[PDB]
Ligand SMILES: O=C(Oc1c(Br)cc(Br)cc1CNC(=O)c1ccccc1[N+](=O)[O-])c1ccc(Cl)cc1
């Protein structure tokens with residue numbers, strides 16, 4: 561089932577496969593981001609997914625990589641961080657959550673990625689729900705499968721991003 | 726349930742909880758091994774579990790970390806490597822298999838560990854089974870739980886081992 565990711569050729573097909581797998585687990589929007597070992601900026605990043613273009617552009621332009629609490633979490637942990645104003649603290653973090661919400665990305669989680677060759681990144685996934693309690697139930701229900709998925713995505717994605725011609 | 730590891734008082738309780746979780750999942754033998762970022766040897770290694778003393782000693786004395794096919798795998802991948810005939814390619818690797826088997830460790834898997842601060846390790850677990858078919862069925866039934874377990878063990882073990 562996860563073998564399809566390795567089987568695919570090209571970032572187009574790979575991203576579509578990952579998006580479908582995530583959708584089948586109940587997540588309508590995902591972002592897979594991966595950096596080479598000891599990256600000092602985002603110039604060499606591999607970023608694929610179906611987050612809206614407007615949000616992608618805004619997050620970049622507003623410098624949210626330095627605000628987003630899930631980013632610093634990824635540098636410190638292999639465990640997922642669930643999206644909660646709570647991981648929000650500062651005024652800019654308040655701004656970030658408000659704007660993410662406005663973009664339609666309210667509930668979700670970010671799974672850190674730490675590759676065998678020092679690759680650093682995340683698979684972030686948003687879930688549409690009536691409320692946070694329901695979102696949490698949807699997410700808990702698929703957490704073991706998502707845990708496998710994130711490592712399969714890391715192993716195959718690192719190859720696609722940085723290695724395969 | 727997994728957070729019991731990080732909520733443990735220290736090394737002794739952490740090891741007992743880890744071994745108990747594994748046992749409850751159906752694995753009577755486990756080994757958690759973790760090295761700090763960019764290790765030259767095993768002088769600062771954090772190694773915990775209930776592998777038999779005799780086998781621990783033999784592996785060290787034989788220098789099996791240079792032969793064990795799961796070790797090289799861990800340096801290349803985040804995915805588990807199951808203990809199957811195909812992973813033992815050379816006679817030296819076959820001899821390793823036979824010695825591990827003679828020690829009681831025949832069926833199992835090794836989960837690579839790659840920490841946020843460059844920690845490198847493995848969580849290995851062995852199941853006592855009658856044959857390969859029974860071993861495989863059992864491991865497939867628990868694999869998703871084990872997959873979460875290894876990351877919780879890593880995050881808590883790294884915090885315990887190097888801080
Ligand atoms: O992919 C990465 O960051 C990015 C990048 Br780039 C662009 C966007 Br747009 C979003 C993210 C990550 N945040 C989220 O997904 C998120 C989190 C909480 C609430 C809402 C959202 N949300 O809706 O965006 C990344 C991962 C690891 C590292 Cl170490 C560095 C960067």
Ligand SMILES: O=C(Oc1c(Br)cc(Br)cc1CNC(=O)c1ccccc1[N+](=O)[O-])c1ccc(Cl)cc1
Nearest residue numbers: 758780781784795796799808825830845846847849
């Ligand atoms: O913990 C580590 O290795 C060790 C160390 Br030390 C001591 C012993 Br004893 C065993 C291992 C790992 N092999 C196994 O468990 C195994 C695998 C297949 C078949 C049989 C067995 N088996 O029965 O031992 C380690 C992990 C990552 C790195 Cl990068 C380096 C070392």
